[PDB]
Design an enzyme around this catalytic site. Sequence first.
Site, mmCIF file in Angstrom:
data_model
loop_
_atom_site.group_PDB
_atom_site.id
_atom_site.type_symbol
_atom_site.label_atom_id
_atom_site.label_comp_id
_atom_site.label_asym_id
_atom_site.label_seq_id
_atom_site.Cartn_x
_atom_site.Cartn_y
_atom_site.Cartn_z
ATOM 1 C CE1 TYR A 181 -3.984 2.264 0.780
ATOM 2 C CE2 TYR A 181 -2.367 3.393 2.135
ATOM 3 C CZ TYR A 181 -3.593 3.367 1.511
ATOM 4 O OH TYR A 181 -4.423 4.457 1.631
ATOM 5 C CB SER A 182 3.637 2.332 2.250
ATOM 6 O OG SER A 182 2.896 2.110 3.438
HETATM 7 N N1 LIG Z 1 -10.666 5.501 4.700
HETATM 8 C C1 LIG Z 1 -9.484 5.772 5.244
HETATM 9 O O1 LIG Z 1 -9.234 5.633 6.623
HETATM 10 C C2 LIG Z 1 -8.362 6.243 4.377
HETATM 11 C C3 LIG Z 1 -7.184 6.629 4.995
HETATM 12 C C4 LIG Z 1 -6.137 7.118 4.237
HETATM 13 C C5 LIG Z 1 -6.290 7.210 2.863
HETATM 14 N N2 LIG Z 1 -7.460 6.827 2.267
HETATM 15 C C6 LIG Z 1 -7.559 6.939 0.806
HETATM 16 O O2 LIG Z 1 -8.814 7.432 0.404
HETATM 17 C C7 LIG Z 1 -9.216 6.795 -0.792
HETATM 18 C C8 LIG Z 1 -10.599 6.201 -0.613
HETATM 19 O O3 LIG Z 1 -10.620 5.421 0.555
HETATM 20 P P1 LIG Z 1 -11.996 4.724 1.025
HETATM 21 O O4 LIG Z 1 -11.766 4.159 2.371
HETATM 22 O O5 LIG Z 1 -13.139 5.642 0.803
HETATM 23 O O6 LIG Z 1 -12.149 3.513 -0.024
HETATM 24 P P2 LIG Z 1 -13.284 2.380 -0.147
HETATM 25 O O7 LIG Z 1 -14.435 2.719 0.723
HETATM 26 O O8 LIG Z 1 -12.721 1.052 0.180
HETATM 27 O O9 LIG Z 1 -13.710 2.427 -1.694
HETATM 28 C C9 LIG Z 1 -12.724 2.196 -2.670
HETATM 29 C C10 LIG Z 1 -13.342 2.367 -4.047
HETATM 30 O O10 LIG Z 1 -12.496 1.797 -5.031
HETATM 31 C C11 LIG Z 1 -13.234 0.868 -5.796
HETATM 32 N N3 LIG Z 1 -12.374 -0.206 -6.299
HETATM 33 C C12 LIG Z 1 -11.849 -1.285 -5.636
HETATM 34 N N4 LIG Z 1 -11.116 -2.005 -6.522
HETATM 35 C C13 LIG Z 1 -11.170 -1.394 -7.728
HETATM 36 C C14 LIG Z 1 -10.622 -1.687 -8.969
HETATM 37 N N5 LIG Z 1 -9.859 -2.766 -9.141
HETATM 38 N N6 LIG Z 1 -10.881 -0.851 -10.034
HETATM 39 C C15 LIG Z 1 -11.667 0.271 -9.870
HETATM 40 N N7 LIG Z 1 -12.209 0.562 -8.637
HETATM 41 C C16 LIG Z 1 -11.962 -0.264 -7.595
HETATM 42 C C17 LIG Z 1 -14.336 0.366 -4.889
HETATM 43 O O11 LIG Z 1 -15.468 -0.067 -5.615
HETATM 44 P P3 LIG Z 1 -15.581 -1.528 -6.284
HETATM 45 O O12 LIG Z 1 -15.130 -2.616 -5.341
HETATM 46 O O13 LIG Z 1 -17.021 -1.754 -6.666
HETATM 47 O O14 LIG Z 1 -14.722 -1.548 -7.526
HETATM 48 C C18 LIG Z 1 -14.667 1.633 -4.137
HETATM 49 O O15 LIG Z 1 -15.557 2.411 -4.909
HETATM 50 C C19 LIG Z 1 -8.202 5.713 -1.101
HETATM 51 O O16 LIG Z 1 -7.327 6.199 -2.088
HETATM 52 C C20 LIG Z 1 -7.430 5.564 0.183
HETATM 53 O O17 LIG Z 1 -6.087 5.257 -0.092
HETATM 54 C C21 LIG Z 1 -8.502 6.340 2.999
HETATM 55 C C1 LIG Z 2 -3.610 5.681 10.731
HETATM 56 C C2 LIG Z 2 -3.880 4.839 9.493
HETATM 57 C C3 LIG Z 2 -3.976 3.371 9.890
HETATM 58 N N1 LIG Z 2 -2.642 2.893 10.236
HETATM 59 C C4 LIG Z 2 -2.742 1.566 10.869
HETATM 60 C C5 LIG Z 2 -1.420 1.134 11.507
HETATM 61 C C6 LIG Z 2 -0.721 1.985 12.532
HETATM 62 N N2 LIG Z 2 -1.255 3.159 12.867
HETATM 63 O O1 LIG Z 2 0.316 1.563 13.010
HETATM 64 C C7 LIG Z 2 -0.429 0.387 10.634
HETATM 65 C C8 LIG Z 2 -1.216 -0.362 11.707
HETATM 66 C C9 LIG Z 2 -1.940 2.821 8.957
HETATM 67 C C10 LIG Z 2 -1.691 4.223 8.414
HETATM 68 N N3 LIG Z 2 -2.833 5.171 8.492
HETATM 69 S S1 LIG Z 2 -3.474 5.474 7.027
HETATM 70 O O2 LIG Z 2 -2.440 5.871 6.112
HETATM 71 O O3 LIG Z 2 -4.421 6.552 7.120
HETATM 72 C C11 LIG Z 2 -4.224 4.197 6.435
HETATM 73 C C12 LIG Z 2 -5.529 3.920 6.824
HETATM 74 C C13 LIG Z 2 -6.182 2.807 6.310
HETATM 75 C C14 LIG Z 2 -5.534 1.974 5.406
HETATM 76 C C15 LIG Z 2 -6.251 0.776 4.856
HETATM 77 C C16 LIG Z 2 -6.081 0.731 3.346
HETATM 78 O O4 LIG Z 2 -7.638 0.880 5.175
HETATM 79 C C17 LIG Z 2 -5.742 -0.501 5.509
HETATM 80 F F1 LIG Z 2 -4.422 -0.582 5.439
HETATM 81 F F2 LIG Z 2 -6.125 -0.486 6.772
HETATM 82 F F3 LIG Z 2 -6.279 -1.541 4.892
HETATM 83 C C18 LIG Z 2 -4.231 2.256 5.015
HETATM 84 C C19 LIG Z 2 -3.578 3.366 5.528
#
Ligand SMILES: NC(=O)c1ccc[n+]([C@@H]2O[C@H](COP(=O)([O-])OP(=O)(O)OC[C@H]3O[C@@H](n4cnc5c(N)ncnc54)[C@H](OP(=O)(O)O)[C@@H]3O)[C@@H](O)[C@H]2O)c1
Ligand SMILES: C[C@@H]1CN(CC2(C(N)=O)CC2)CCN1S(=O)(=O)c1ccc([C@](C)(O)C(F)(F)F)cc1
Lengths: 265, 261
Positions: free
Chosen positions: B163-164
Amino acid sequence: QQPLNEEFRPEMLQGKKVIVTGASKGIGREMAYHLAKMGAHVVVTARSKETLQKVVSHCLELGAASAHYIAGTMEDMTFAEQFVAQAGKLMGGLDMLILNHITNTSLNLFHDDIHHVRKSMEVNFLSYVVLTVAALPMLKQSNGSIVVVSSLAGKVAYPMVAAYSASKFALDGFFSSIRKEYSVSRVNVSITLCVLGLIDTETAMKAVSGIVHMQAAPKEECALEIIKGGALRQEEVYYDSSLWTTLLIRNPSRKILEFLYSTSY
Amino acid sequence: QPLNEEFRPEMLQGKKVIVTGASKGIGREMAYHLAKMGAHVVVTARSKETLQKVVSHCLELGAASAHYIAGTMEDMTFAEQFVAQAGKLMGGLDMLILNHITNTSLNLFHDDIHHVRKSMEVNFLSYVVLTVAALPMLKQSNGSIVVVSSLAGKVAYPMVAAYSASKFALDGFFSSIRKEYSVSRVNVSITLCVLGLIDTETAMKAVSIVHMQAAPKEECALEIIKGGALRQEEVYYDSSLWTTLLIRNPSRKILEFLYST
Ligand SMILES: NC(=O)c1ccc[n+]([C@@H]2O[C@H](COP(=O)([O-])OP(=O)(O)OC[C@H]3O[C@@H](n4cnc5c(N)ncnc54)[C@H](OP(=O)(O)O)[C@@H]3O)[C@@H](O)[C@H]2O)c1
Ligand SMILES: C[C@@H]1CN(CC2(C(N)=O)CC2)CCN1S(=O)(=O)c1ccc([C@](C)(O)C(F)(F)F)cc1
Ligand SMILES: NC(=O)c1ccc[n+]([C@@H]2O[C@H](COP(=O)([O-])OP(=O)(O)OC[C@H]3O[C@@H](n4cnc5c(N)ncnc54)[C@H](OP(=O)(O)O)[C@@H]3O)[C@@H](O)[C@H]2O)c1
Ligand SMILES: C[C@@H]1CN(CC2(C(N)=O)CC2)CCN1S(=O)(=O)c1ccc([C@](C)(O)C(F)(F)F)cc1
């Protein structure tokens, strides 16, 4: 990851078993040479069989406990995986895995060269992960070390090196993450990420030609510093012509935040 | 070159905006906010069913228009054609919001190489392909590209290696071309967003392995849109003020300035 608490000494590498990739020219070659001098067992890789041979020739006259080359392209992950296996056998184990090769790249604006972006990620990043996966078992065996060679373009943003830079950043994110994973699973394999400024390797000099006039550190010293850092199990090394550069590019806060989130959980 | 003024909803009214990964979580909230602002919207994801629900609600919310094209960003031909299809439909493009990521949970890396390749293909490569495909239209409108990233895309943690890698890749590639645009006088802004934990359903399941406060998705989405509209270089959004202030790396912008002149 606990770095070693002592000055470096050449004998730290005597009888050690080291893979060096991208060892046909530039920094890689210099690293192989330095390891020869220290009586290390060495295995060098790259695509040019012919240049690889000359390297090996010199590594032997320099006092290498043993030197081999294996030619192939890191474009091919099956090769990468097999290479480490063959090197493991050529030496009877592994103490250090030096990942140094990069795909052929030069200074261009990104004119939607999606192909060069993908090749950069395969060669410069993905193959390193493959090479690593292959070497871990052996490295666990010898409580050894991984050295990832990277660049200033892998810490801050520059124009003209978008794909390259994307790949070097990738190495940081990935290898810095696994470093934490090893700490908590307590795997005693050290990871050293090297951040380099301009080095006077043939390739680099031709690439920046007239496009940017700036001092370039010597490749020999540069290669020695990569080894020392790897040997003392440092988390990161910094090498540039300027001290202004090498002191400023380090990110003090990030290291503090990371530690601060480790104590939290 | 950002905009010294404050943000107002009307900066989006009638703007043609793509949002990827917009079937749930933050992606869905963005389409929703855009619709509230009277923007033209095309969303995408694999699941057509849920996309259908997002579209219907966007129209309910005041969307100027709201359409979906379903596919997988594992496919770079689709990614390319998706952009062309969406732009032709809308008549052009003002803002490309890149948000999707491959399915991810918390795991120690375990020779798990297939996941590393896929994370790079989906989380990173596909962003480059959509950008290439959107760029001509963006030049026409002096539009903007918004890349969604993470804390883990700026600092290192366990459990998110692949992911990172991909998020770090995003910062390296996009910051680099941002400088390229700067010197080729291409006025398309690039906005990198650094998000901590957001209460998205999917994120709350991957952790909850660790307890920490989570920011509201609805607000997070707006901040991401704000920053894009304003053409800011980076957006930081965590619940804790200590993070949103400490995650910043001022020396880096200082160095990049000093090494450019
Ligand atoms: N939520 C957090 O705590 C968090 C933290 C840090 C960063 N972010 C970033 O914020 C963004 C959105 O996060 P989120 O938590 O809202 O995501 P999410 O709820 O898991 O939704 C991800 C979206 O991507 C789609 N997707 C999955 N696989 C795909 C593929 N192969 N091709 C096209 N679409 C695909 C999913 O729909 P389908 O499965 O139907 O394709 C869904 O619409 C991400 O870039 C994530 O890195 C989130
Ligand atoms: C604070 C969060 C969660 N950390 C969990 C953590 C810690 N803190 O030590 C590492 C144990 C990872 C770093 N961040 S984050 O960049 O926003 C982040 C949030 C959610 C996600 C994803 C995609 O949902 C997930 F990996 F969980 F599948 C990835 C990154
Ligand atoms: N030199 C600098 O100014 C500088 C600055 C910053 C960072 N660095 C880092 O230092 C490292 C070495 O740089 P360098 O200037 O010494 O490079 P270099 O002189 O160009 O050497 C690159 C090496 O990689 C090999 N290689 C190229 N393509 C390959 C492929 N597809 N598969 C396997 N091997 C391949 C080459 O051998 P073959 O052609 O035979 O394959 C060669 O031995 C790089 O990681 C770079 O990021 C260098
Ligand atoms: C200061 C140098 C050179 N920069 C040249 C630069 C600037 N400074 O503005 C961008 C015009 C790129 C950033 N660094 S670097 O990370 O060390 C570095 C050195 C060499 C190389 C390569 C692969 O050899 C090259 F791209 F040239 F082919 C890549 C990175």
